[PDB]
Amino acid sequence: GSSKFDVPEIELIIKASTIDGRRKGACLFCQEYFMDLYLLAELKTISLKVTTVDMQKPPNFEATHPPILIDNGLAILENEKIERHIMKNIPGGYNLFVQDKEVATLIENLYVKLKLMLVKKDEAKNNALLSHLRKINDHLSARNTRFLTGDTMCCFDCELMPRLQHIRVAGKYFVDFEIPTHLTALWRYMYHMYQLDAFTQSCPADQDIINHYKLQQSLKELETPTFTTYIPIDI
Ligand SMILES: [Ca+2]
DSSP: OOGGGOOOEEEEEEEBOTTTSSSBOOOHHHHHHHHHHHHHHHTTSSEEEEEEEOTTSOOOOTTOOSOEEEETTEEEOSHHHHHHHHHHHSTTHHHHSOOOHHHHHHHTTHHHHHHHHHTSOOHHHHHHHHHHHHHHHHHHHHHOOSBTTBSSOOHHHHHHHHHHHHHHHHHHHHHOOOOOTTOHHHHHHHHHHHTOHHHHHHOOOHHHHHHHHHHHHTOOOOOOOOOOOOOSSOO
């Protein structure tokens, strides 16, 4: 009828793969906010446009790194402000940002544990990450809900799921870490993560997650992208 009724178009700028400069890259913040916005766009409150930029060949923002969220000409540049903007200013946002301090505290600092483990093979560092995943598993088991705070995705899921994927992919490649099979509720959560469009649409390829850490550790293009999705147990 009228442009007056158009749902808002949100643009998310994300970092490109450091292998080909075109595929989505492996930034956890990009994936988290890609996932939040995808869920909101599924709910048809918004339109989502995802723009990939090659940070060493960029085609307004100056010194700020992706992600950057553009809402009708207004550019949100700091990650904490992107969250706040999604929660407060984008329709659907308040429902996505569930209040659950228990869950916030549960998942806090998970990523630095992965980082420290990757430095080199160290079982003590491996087991520190494993203890945290046990806590998450035991939360999930106690709640018996599909996701962290219930049967619907929230903000905390979009933060957790991308880190579980870097743990699986980079954990295994660099230091032969695997998430053990007795973490039944956690494996069931990942099983569902792989069935989720927001996840699979935003998930970088394995090669890009790996390359991401290789550059971080300064080690060393035709490898066809593949995606780790297997579950080592029956569900
Ligand atoms: Ca940013």
